[PDB]
XYZ file of C-alpha atoms in Angstrom:
549
model
C 30.932 -42.153 -12.362
C 31.060 -42.530 -16.142
C 29.262 -41.104 -19.171
C 25.472 -41.213 -19.109
C 22.520 -39.764 -20.978
C 21.454 -36.335 -19.720
C 18.683 -35.700 -22.275
C 17.095 -38.463 -24.360
C 15.186 -38.007 -27.625
C 12.525 -40.679 -27.141
C 9.244 -40.573 -29.084
C 10.042 -37.209 -30.650
C 10.130 -35.521 -27.224
C 13.176 -34.346 -25.273
C 13.096 -35.828 -21.757
C 15.627 -35.460 -18.941
C 17.350 -38.432 -17.320
C 16.518 -38.359 -13.578
C 19.735 -40.201 -12.702
C 21.789 -37.560 -14.531
C 20.055 -34.792 -12.578
C 20.928 -36.783 -9.450
C 24.633 -36.580 -10.303
C 24.435 -32.843 -11.022
C 22.614 -32.142 -7.750
C 25.708 -33.471 -5.930
C 28.277 -31.328 -7.799
C 28.849 -28.419 -5.414
C 31.853 -27.094 -7.357
C 31.657 -24.601 -10.234
C 31.383 -26.394 -13.574
C 33.208 -25.734 -16.834
C 30.743 -27.017 -19.440
C 32.371 -28.008 -22.743
C 29.971 -29.238 -25.430
C 31.281 -31.191 -28.416
C 28.636 -30.820 -31.126
C 28.446 -32.403 -34.552
C 26.910 -35.077 -36.713
C 26.863 -38.765 -35.851
C 30.163 -40.618 -36.306
C 32.550 -37.648 -36.483
C 34.938 -38.682 -33.704
C 33.200 -36.647 -31.004
C 33.769 -39.320 -28.354
C 37.522 -39.230 -29.009
C 37.701 -35.545 -28.073
C 35.505 -36.378 -25.071
C 37.915 -39.044 -23.814
C 41.031 -36.951 -24.446
C 39.589 -33.980 -22.545
C 38.600 -36.208 -19.606
C 20.374 -40.141 -29.578
C 20.113 -37.148 -27.231
C 22.745 -35.259 -25.228
C 25.096 -37.337 -23.077
C 26.985 -36.138 -20.012
C 30.390 -37.050 -18.576
C 31.210 -35.188 -15.359
C 34.876 -35.450 -14.378
C 37.231 -33.525 -12.059
C 38.658 -30.724 -14.165
C 42.205 -31.902 -14.983
C 43.927 -28.499 -14.920
C 41.894 -26.072 -12.741
C 41.441 -27.650 -9.290
C 38.247 -27.556 -7.233
C 36.353 -27.307 -10.539
C 34.223 -29.967 -12.229
C 34.443 -30.476 -15.999
C 31.014 -31.251 -17.473
C 31.568 -32.750 -20.931
C 28.484 -32.778 -23.171
C 28.135 -34.722 -26.427
C 25.290 -34.311 -28.923
C 24.623 -37.943 -29.847
C 22.852 -39.035 -33.006
C 22.618 -35.727 -34.857
C 21.953 -36.495 -38.516
C 14.185 -35.491 -35.779
C 13.145 -31.876 -35.244
C 14.936 -32.103 -31.887
C 18.295 -32.060 -33.699
C 17.950 -28.269 -33.728
C 16.746 -28.194 -30.117
C 19.752 -30.328 -29.152
C 21.986 -27.788 -30.897
C 20.271 -24.903 -29.099
C 20.468 -26.657 -25.721
C 24.203 -27.223 -26.198
C 24.521 -23.467 -26.775
C 22.611 -22.470 -23.638
C 24.196 -25.061 -21.335
C 27.852 -24.859 -22.404
C 30.604 -22.361 -21.685
C 32.598 -23.623 -24.691
C 30.832 -24.864 -27.833
C 33.017 -27.165 -29.945
C 31.393 -27.765 -33.331
C 32.862 -30.857 -34.988
C 32.656 -31.594 -38.713
C 34.529 -33.696 -41.258
C 36.751 -32.076 -43.864
C 36.911 -28.343 -44.568
C 34.692 -25.260 -44.338
C 32.748 -25.344 -47.615
C 29.147 -25.147 -48.823
C 28.348 -28.565 -47.346
C 29.940 -27.765 -43.978
C 27.979 -24.508 -43.704
C 24.736 -26.264 -44.673
C 25.244 -28.846 -41.922
C 25.683 -25.859 -39.579
C 22.233 -24.457 -40.424
C 21.311 -24.837 -36.741
C 23.264 -21.654 -35.974
C 20.988 -19.761 -38.385
C 17.911 -20.952 -36.450
C 18.998 -19.813 -32.971
C 17.157 -16.513 -33.469
C 13.955 -18.569 -33.879
C 14.679 -21.091 -31.091
C 16.468 -19.130 -28.321
C 15.284 -16.008 -26.491
C 17.806 -13.964 -24.528
C 15.087 -11.884 -22.828
C 11.331 -11.841 -22.232
C 10.567 -8.689 -24.258
C 14.030 -1.622 -27.691
C 16.972 -3.954 -28.318
C 17.187 -6.785 -30.827
C 17.110 -10.133 -29.031
C 19.993 -11.605 -31.042
C 22.189 -8.642 -30.064
C 22.348 -10.175 -26.565
C 23.652 -13.597 -27.632
C 27.302 -12.522 -27.473
C 26.772 -11.430 -23.854
C 26.181 -15.023 -22.687
C 26.900 -17.385 -25.599
C 29.759 -19.878 -25.231
C 33.127 -19.677 -26.915
C 32.960 -21.078 -30.447
C 35.500 -23.690 -31.555
C 35.339 -25.351 -34.979
C 37.290 -28.616 -35.051
C 38.029 -29.892 -38.566
C 38.831 -33.604 -38.764
C 40.832 -35.233 -41.562
C 41.590 -31.738 -42.855
C 42.899 -31.901 -46.427
C 43.968 -28.322 -47.238
C 47.497 -26.977 -46.858
C 47.696 -23.923 -44.587
C 49.372 -21.521 -47.011
C 48.295 -18.395 -48.901
C 50.620 -16.959 -51.556
C 53.618 -18.942 -50.344
C 53.390 -17.910 -46.677
C 52.077 -20.194 -43.914
C 48.677 -19.691 -42.293
C 47.156 -20.794 -38.993
C 43.951 -22.688 -38.288
C 42.467 -19.511 -36.806
C 43.430 -17.617 -39.965
C 41.638 -20.212 -42.098
C 38.504 -19.636 -40.016
C 38.604 -15.845 -40.393
C 39.062 -16.251 -44.152
C 36.237 -18.801 -44.262
C 34.005 -16.389 -42.308
C 34.467 -13.462 -44.710
C 31.300 -12.451 -46.546
C 30.642 -12.165 -50.281
C 28.934 -9.097 -51.743
C 25.534 -9.073 -53.405
C 21.905 -8.864 -52.358
C 20.386 -11.938 -54.034
C 19.106 -15.044 -52.265
C 22.362 -16.975 -52.693
C 24.668 -14.223 -51.411
C 22.614 -13.880 -48.218
C 22.348 -17.634 -47.622
C 26.146 -17.667 -47.905
C 26.475 -14.808 -45.403
C 23.824 -15.825 -42.859
C 25.805 -18.625 -41.121
C 28.993 -16.536 -41.077
C 27.287 -13.493 -39.559
C 25.714 -15.702 -36.887
C 29.140 -17.073 -35.942
C 30.688 -13.599 -35.989
C 27.902 -11.823 -34.069
C 26.657 -14.485 -31.634
C 29.845 -15.840 -30.038
C 32.320 -13.773 -27.979
C 35.289 -15.970 -28.950
C 35.947 -18.013 -32.079
C 38.716 -20.569 -32.552
C 39.654 -23.287 -35.020
C 41.648 -26.519 -34.843
C 42.499 -28.791 -37.775
C 43.372 -32.478 -37.578
C 45.259 -34.528 -40.149
C 44.580 -38.145 -41.037
C 45.672 -39.977 -37.849
C 47.451 -42.666 -39.916
C 46.336 -45.292 -37.356
C 48.819 -48.161 -37.364
C 46.253 -50.601 -35.930
C 42.706 -51.300 -37.116
C 40.434 -50.694 -34.120
C 36.845 -49.633 -33.557
C 37.729 -46.607 -31.402
C 40.654 -44.237 -31.902
C 40.921 -44.008 -28.103
C 42.290 -47.577 -28.163
C 45.494 -46.642 -30.021
C 48.802 -45.898 -28.334
C 50.702 -42.695 -29.046
C 53.222 -44.882 -30.891
C 50.472 -46.048 -33.276
C 49.337 -42.568 -34.380
C 50.590 -39.884 -36.739
C 52.962 -37.664 -34.702
C 51.386 -34.551 -36.233
C 47.830 -35.601 -35.354
C 48.929 -36.234 -31.757
C 50.144 -32.649 -31.354
C 47.017 -31.201 -32.977
C 45.045 -33.065 -30.306
C 47.427 -31.865 -27.586
C 47.086 -28.239 -28.708
C 43.298 -28.625 -28.826
C 43.006 -30.184 -25.363
C 45.434 -27.666 -23.860
C 43.426 -24.706 -25.167
C 39.991 -26.067 -24.237
C 41.110 -27.064 -20.739
C 43.002 -23.789 -20.167
C 40.736 -21.153 -21.753
C 37.245 -22.598 -21.235
C 35.502 -20.360 -18.713
C 33.378 -21.413 -15.766
C 29.733 -21.424 -16.815
C 28.388 -18.125 -15.480
C 25.017 -16.390 -15.355
C 24.511 -12.647 -15.741
C 25.816 -11.024 -12.573
C 28.964 -13.125 -12.258
C 26.995 -16.033 -10.773
C 29.127 -19.198 -11.122
C 27.087 -22.171 -12.310
C 27.499 -25.456 -10.436
C 25.735 -28.821 -10.439
C 22.370 -27.830 -8.956
C 22.328 -24.543 -10.879
C 23.075 -26.353 -14.141
C 20.402 -28.898 -13.187
C 17.837 -26.095 -12.937
C 18.784 -24.805 -16.395
C 18.309 -28.259 -17.932
C 14.867 -28.647 -16.348
C 13.685 -25.168 -17.347
C 14.956 -25.343 -20.932
C 13.695 -28.891 -21.526
C 10.252 -28.286 -20.017
C 9.950 -25.115 -22.100
C 10.551 -27.137 -25.273
C 8.056 -29.811 -24.216
C 5.444 -27.190 -23.259
C 5.575 -25.664 -26.751
C 7.518 -22.621 -25.530
C 10.984 -21.361 -26.488
C 13.976 -21.783 -24.149
C 14.709 -18.400 -22.579
C 17.793 -17.381 -20.614
C 15.904 -14.840 -18.498
C 13.147 -17.295 -17.561
C 15.830 -19.843 -16.648
C 17.806 -17.361 -14.541
C 14.646 -16.268 -12.711
C 13.484 -19.860 -12.196
C 16.806 -20.444 -10.434
C 16.338 -17.183 -8.520
C 13.013 -18.473 -7.175
C 14.759 -21.538 -5.747
C 17.839 -19.825 -4.310
C 15.909 -16.778 -3.089
C 13.443 -19.073 -1.321
C 16.441 -20.725 0.344
C 17.949 -17.315 1.126
C 14.849 -16.482 3.173
C 15.069 -19.764 5.090
C 18.808 -19.254 5.598
C 18.204 -15.730 6.915
C 15.401 -16.935 9.199
C 17.642 -19.705 10.541
C 20.346 -17.147 11.309
C 17.800 -14.895 13.023
C 16.304 -17.730 15.081
C 19.727 -18.694 16.445
C 20.834 -15.088 16.989
C 17.780 -14.525 19.213
C 17.883 -17.823 21.118
C 21.497 -17.073 21.995
C 20.942 -13.521 23.274
C 17.306 -13.247 24.468
C 16.283 -13.873 28.081
C 11.567 -11.431 30.830
C 13.587 -8.428 29.654
C 14.047 -5.402 31.891
C 12.908 -3.067 29.092
C 10.949 -3.383 25.866
C 13.706 -1.359 24.194
C 16.205 -4.064 25.175
C 14.181 -6.658 23.260
C 13.522 -4.466 20.212
C 17.204 -3.555 19.837
C 18.274 -7.206 19.926
C 15.591 -7.994 17.342
C 16.916 -5.280 15.022
C 20.474 -6.566 15.490
C 19.472 -10.115 14.555
C 17.272 -8.697 11.792
C 20.263 -6.740 10.474
C 22.461 -9.843 10.356
C 19.586 -11.872 8.886
C 19.246 -9.366 6.034
C 22.986 -9.683 5.401
C 22.553 -13.439 4.937
C 19.643 -12.939 2.533
C 21.517 -10.332 0.485
C 24.664 -12.472 0.281
C 22.635 -15.516 -0.857
C 19.954 -13.968 -3.103
C 19.738 -12.529 -6.603
C 17.180 -11.322 -9.147
C 14.572 -10.792 -6.411
C 11.881 -9.475 -8.745
C 9.590 -6.954 -7.025
C 11.418 -7.657 -3.732
C 8.925 -10.496 -3.230
C 11.293 -12.735 -1.266
C 12.835 -9.876 0.720
C 9.270 -8.855 1.588
C 8.463 -12.466 2.506
C 11.473 -12.364 4.836
C 10.536 -8.984 6.297
C 7.047 -10.200 7.170
C 8.371 -13.370 8.816
C 10.732 -11.229 10.909
C 7.979 -8.816 11.959
C 5.954 -11.811 13.157
C 8.829 -13.165 15.255
C 9.102 -9.741 16.909
C 5.422 -9.976 17.839
C 6.009 -13.497 19.175
C 8.959 -12.381 21.310
C 6.986 -9.401 22.618
C 3.927 -11.502 23.477
C 6.095 -14.111 25.207
C 8.005 -11.363 27.020
C 4.711 -10.022 28.386
C 3.204 -13.318 29.553
C 6.555 -14.330 31.048
C 6.567 -11.084 33.031
C 2.903 -11.568 33.955
C 3.430 -15.171 35.065
C 6.514 -14.174 37.062
C 4.894 -11.174 38.747
C 1.698 -13.092 39.527
C 3.753 -15.641 41.465
C 5.321 -12.794 43.454
C 1.855 -11.519 44.409
C 0.775 -14.756 46.096
C 4.306 -15.198 47.463
C 4.451 -11.705 48.986
C 0.797 -10.722 49.488
C -0.161 -14.174 50.746
C 0.781 -13.503 54.368
C -1.196 -10.245 54.176
C -4.369 -11.784 52.736
C -4.276 -14.352 55.549
C -3.734 -11.776 58.301
C -6.842 -9.919 57.124
C -9.042 -13.025 56.918
C -8.550 -13.617 60.669
C -9.016 -10.066 61.905
C -5.366 -9.137 62.380
C -6.293 -5.605 61.253
C -10.022 -5.582 62.149
C -9.620 -3.530 65.314
C -9.120 0.057 66.542
C -6.079 1.440 64.761
C -6.005 -1.587 62.473
C -6.226 0.240 59.153
C -3.069 2.204 59.972
C -1.210 -1.050 60.646
C -2.681 -2.505 57.444
C -1.530 0.223 55.053
C 1.924 0.267 56.661
C 2.411 -3.476 56.199
C 0.937 -3.184 52.698
C 3.554 -0.538 51.907
C 6.219 -2.855 53.321
C 5.108 -5.636 50.973
C 4.803 -3.287 47.995
C 8.444 -2.343 48.564
C 9.288 -6.054 48.680
C 7.546 -6.434 45.313
C 9.449 -3.457 43.898
C 12.805 -4.707 45.202
C 12.691 -8.149 43.578
C 15.016 -7.931 40.544
C 14.374 -9.449 37.116
C 10.753 -8.295 36.977
C 9.485 -8.025 33.428
C 7.695 -5.060 31.889
C 4.340 -6.070 33.428
C 5.335 -5.433 37.057
C 3.350 -2.214 37.512
C 0.334 -3.454 35.536
C -0.055 -6.715 37.462
C 0.362 -4.989 40.831
C -2.146 -2.244 40.002
C -4.723 -4.776 38.811
C -4.239 -6.767 42.021
C -4.565 -3.826 44.420
C -7.534 -2.338 42.556
C -9.233 -5.723 43.052
C -8.452 -5.689 46.798
C -9.742 -2.133 47.298
C -13.014 -3.226 48.916
C -11.091 -5.218 51.533
C -9.010 -2.160 52.416
C -12.143 0.000 52.425
C -13.827 -2.343 54.914
C -10.864 -2.081 57.286
C -11.021 1.699 56.855
C -14.740 2.023 57.592
C -14.582 -0.363 60.578
C -11.620 1.369 62.265
C -13.275 3.061 65.251
C -10.208 5.277 65.831
C -10.870 7.409 62.718
C -13.463 10.129 62.251
C -15.869 9.955 59.330
C -13.985 12.875 57.753
C -10.638 11.065 57.882
C -12.274 8.034 56.275
C -13.605 10.356 53.565
C -10.173 11.967 53.147
C -8.466 8.568 52.944
C -10.922 7.435 50.268
C -10.066 10.491 48.161
C -6.341 9.874 48.662
C -6.732 6.330 47.326
C -8.921 7.558 44.464
C -6.289 10.180 43.628
C -3.560 7.546 43.987
C -5.410 5.318 41.516
C -5.955 8.193 39.079
C -2.217 8.907 39.135
C -1.493 5.219 38.524
C -3.848 5.214 35.534
C -1.973 8.259 34.216
C 1.498 6.729 34.530
C 0.121 3.540 32.975
C -1.000 5.514 29.919
C 2.337 7.346 29.786
C 4.113 3.978 29.670
C 1.799 2.517 27.011
C 2.582 5.485 24.767
C 6.331 5.380 25.421
C 6.282 1.767 24.223
C 4.295 2.770 21.131
C 7.053 5.264 20.312
C 9.698 2.562 20.771
C 7.628 0.283 18.533
C 7.304 2.997 15.878
C 11.026 3.788 16.036
C 11.960 0.117 15.653
C 9.598 -0.163 12.682
C 11.249 2.897 11.127
C 14.817 1.667 11.632
C 14.097 -1.885 10.460
C 12.625 -0.508 7.231
C 15.641 1.787 6.880
C 18.045 -1.158 7.170
C 16.176 -3.051 4.447
C 16.585 -0.031 2.168
C 20.247 0.411 3.121
C 21.290 -3.149 2.281
C 19.121 -3.490 -0.836
C 20.496 -0.280 -2.353
C 24.040 -1.468 -1.601
C 23.340 -4.777 -3.340
C 21.745 -2.981 -6.296
C 24.815 -0.751 -6.620
C 27.139 -3.764 -6.628
C 24.895 -5.609 -9.088
C 24.598 -2.609 -11.425
C 28.382 -2.161 -11.524
C 28.858 -5.822 -12.452
C 26.226 -5.435 -15.176
C 27.897 -2.398 -16.754
C 31.248 -4.203 -16.752
C 29.579 -7.037 -18.663
C 28.057 -4.502 -21.058
C 31.466 -2.844 -21.466
C 33.039 -6.159 -22.470
C 30.128 -6.997 -24.780
C 30.137 -3.680 -26.645
C 33.910 -3.890 -27.125
C 33.406 -7.142 -29.040
C 30.407 -5.690 -30.884
C 32.540 -2.739 -31.995
C 35.385 -4.952 -33.226
C 33.050 -6.807 -35.597
C 31.765 -3.372 -36.639
C 35.225 -2.104 -37.593
C 36.112 -5.338 -39.401
C 32.811 -5.553 -41.290
C 33.220 -2.015 -42.634
C 36.863 -2.541 -43.605
C 35.783 -5.396 -45.918
C 32.772 -3.563 -47.375
C 29.213 -4.359 -46.267
C 28.281 -0.940 -44.943
C 24.773 -2.188 -44.133
C 26.041 -4.987 -41.882
C 28.379 -2.567 -40.097
C 25.473 -0.157 -39.590
C 23.291 -2.939 -38.177
C 25.776 -3.459 -35.340
C 26.109 0.266 -34.625
C 22.359 0.321 -33.992
C 22.608 -2.861 -31.909
C 25.339 -1.160 -29.874
C 23.244 2.003 -29.584
C 20.162 0.094 -28.419
C 22.293 -1.619 -25.767
C 23.494 1.835 -24.713
C 19.859 2.964 -24.683
C 18.783 -0.078 -22.659
C 21.252 0.690 -19.865
C 20.055 4.274 -19.233
C 16.682 3.332 -17.767
């Protein structure tokens, strides 16, 4: 598709364009977000086309880094309190921030750039020891100042200078402590302290040989050869050095993830709140973590259905549950981040405990159902024999118990009985104990003492059965407790591993950040301004404090 409005400034309120969000939601690739920012009618659209009243979006396949999408943003109609919001949104959403102005870097150019001086009052890096602005360089985009129709000659004291050199010179501070001297220094300190990279490109008068409404319409033949190269150098750098939009933790931003950031930041502005990186990163965590749970559950559900069949042992079932639980946790860890208070991991753990209960309950009824069919199948012939006096006769109780033992062995010898085999058989026999007693008492071949002895043997036999039944109940409780212990252990094992990997990534980011902080500290001191240099040394120290906690 082509360019379209992403955020519109209608009726003094910043509103998102649902169709633009629709396009982002379909960009599965990581996005390099380059924002061209500047006042109205400064040639911004020309740089947009060469690289390919709100903020407009042009998503295009990245020309030079394959399998990446280039999201070009353009602040339209700057120059209206949302003008500053638009500037701030371009900062938060971009990985490279190209500020575009006409002419040179002078008092007027720095006044037009007053938005950079307001970021401390319009952007929050965190939701809280450390100064908030000290975190901007950890996630701000690369800064590029494009100067159009540049009129100065790049030369100091006879020797040539570069566009980058002109920027460094233009960013040097002037001594004093009065209102003017600070107002002169404030924009330059913001540029030097907020952005991890700074670059500058100048552009001469294009000398357009045809009169057209859009510079894009001119052929290379119809343009100043110098200007052409200054555009080529600019495009080459932006397309080659612009980094993939990333969130703290090395999380590459793509369409849907960028979409979430737009929604969060814009709804914060409309709700009277300040856009906040942390709130936006967590908001995205809520969505992806919620999906991580569902993805882990899905994995678990298919791991079980593939490997579960009435199990011979309860341990067999519990071990398979813990195996699928282990792999399910791996999915959640690999697809989750910023799980505050372990809420989603806990949500997952509870859902997995419940499925264990379900499998155990279904394992029991399945065993019960199966074994109950074997009772009527096997002890059907016996119940019928008794109803018609097959064993109601002298010596009949002896024949009865012997055939009952035969059929009990048949019940034992059937394979694939669940864990309820002994329970269902005991309950059945103990319900048929008055039938056996009748055959005992009516057998005229036994003395009253033998009948009394046989009763006590059956009583003792039932007492032993009740004992072994209790011994099995408790053995299962131990297997249940062990499973509960090991499942909890695996949660701890994988979460600590993730936290170790995440903490390492975070310190690497802090190492890079502080290196840049220190460089601006050395430079600031070498040109005077001991106070400014000290302010960074504290900022560095607070960051070092922050990390040891």
